[PDB]
């Protein structure tokens, strides 16, 4: 059965325009297409493949649970999901956990819980959600209404009401929207899709005190920043500000579809029998893989390793920048890194990313003006250097093209 | 340390009260708990495990793709997901496919599409969704609002507006709510959670005619009825009524998390670049497993074997009933079957399910009044008979 890139244009609902080449296998941070062409993968599954492609221990954990059973639905619990839940509890501020299949699902759960909590303790009039312009929280109607790209919601109106958007990093802007009718504030600790913008420490403490004063739940959407991405297990640990609810997905599963809502006891108590659920969520196959991911990522050597790899990327992006004058700045934390184009190259991140693919390196964008790097947290130093040589070659061609 | 059932009550957010025992491995339609106790599984992963537990070809397909790569995200397509798309297109009214990770994400995609379609062609104001009381379409705010059980949506208001609910199987009920302002009519061909109640043929044909007259998209939610469950690949084929959009998940991936929206070319055209998305949807791992599920399920022999199995359950359930006087009726289609409790035992489905489980057979409920069977499509004759023996012994303990 022959499969060609032109078949994509015929068979898929056309919401993505993907690369002209089709990957068939990978290993660590290398990936190969149907013709044998090789790419260093700095796109990292969009900050999902925290341990790279075809990781041998993730494969062994997959196969070992797959040969026992995969799924029953949540009428029956299972050992891997319980052990996963306990790892998450032991490692974070959480007392309890809910599992689902994607970051949007995790965010739906955290916003539902915040609505119910407010309604049960104060009255059903306390429904307001404050989110931030340029945030990304998912594609379901509710989560795309919470995110701050109105282009991604207007077509699907009427939207769920009582949501409004403050400017990121702007505490007065947030303060104007949060009041005693607010149930939740949802914020990414780094706006990933929004250009790799880190929140400042004052901004997050400011949301924590505003949530305290007005009794609203503070929700950190760590679906991109989570699971080692920043050099700590979760970003809130880097920042020292503790949320009431934390969502996690993407790198949680190292590539297997999984996500989770982390909650304090007080918040968890609110969600009684039958008030929420999911058919696939919490199956033992997901749970056995995520379990293994946490075991391999949440170690001092791997997390310090992410701080080390940060500097490899940044020192070398600086020398590339010295040669080609492309970027006003390089920002981010750990291995979520954005290269901000300057005025002479404004809105050209995607063209750079396409040249980079031609030169055999996968990178992402973050809005049209930022080139994004989200490589595997175990990428090797050889893979970082060879991928950046290719990125530097692609920048050279670009600077004439 | 060792995991206990009690840990479940300390660590999980308490949305489910799961069984007292904890499964640890299974094969076909048998499953075993941590103490070695054996169950015949007629729950079938809530109509998900169409091939049973730990299926060796599903395993082989999983491990073979897992040794190439699992995931890139949708900036790059892959061969498994394109092959799976083609299988679905060749086998259904669909021309194009979107992939996601759950039946709710599938229904989100479908309702979004019908919104944009109507908006783009008619205007901002044509936004109405008609759904049916007792429907279940998932747990995202939008899908749980489309669902017809207000008890699962109320707490999370305000709910997305322009949604209304008609009485299932009631053509004039639906006709009253569907006008030129309706963008979509979503409906399950058999209501699963709402008691294993099949649509009638005139009801579906009637929704199709009304959708056509008022230019609204007809969405079939086949996440429970689809992929072989009724004895045809999709229940629409059984009824002979073709939707514009169809959603599928659960049995799609035989236990691996996957879902999909099937669309006609005209409908697919409205979703341009960046208008919807998913990080994990269409990954090659789910795609490889779901491809192999379709290969094994969509065969004359598996599907005719589902018709046969229907008659094994119904004939023996009628025999059990004749003996114990529990139910007023055994209904459903294929291997989605509900035993409706009589007046005397009304509201007791869960107690009969708990008794079943003590006797070594897993069954589900569908509302407090129906006992629901949704076993693997390849359940063997011997599994049906041993599980139904243990169901008989459970009905006997229960009836007293
Ligand atoms: C990608 C992402 C989501 C949504 O994830 P899916 O798994 O695509 O549903 C939510 N939040 C953030 C911060 C993300 O980067
Ligand atoms: C279970 C189910 C859904 C929701 O699927 P999830 O994978 O649980 O999100 C939607 N529709 C029907 C008919 C279902 O049975
Ligand atoms: Mg309540
Ligand atoms: Mg448009
Ligand atoms: Na904790
Ligand atoms: Na077709």
Numbering used by the authors:
A (entry chain B): 3 to 403
B (entry chain A): 3 to 402
Sentences from the paper on this structure:
Escherichia coli possesses two acyl ornithine aminotransferases, one catabolic (AstC) and the other anabolic (ArgD), that participate in L-arginine metabolism. The arginine-succinyl transferase pathway of E. coli provides nitrogen for growth via a series of succinylated intermediates. In conclusion, the E. coli AstC protein, involved in arginine catabolism, is a PLP containing transaminase that is structurally similar to the related protein ArgD, which is the transaminase enzyme used in arginine synthesis. From the biochemical data, it appears that AstC and ArgD are biochemically similar, consistent with the ability of astC to complement an argD deletion. Both have comparable steady state kinetic values, with a strong preference for the acylated ornithine derivatives AO (AstC and ArgD) and SO (for AstC, at least) over ORN itself.
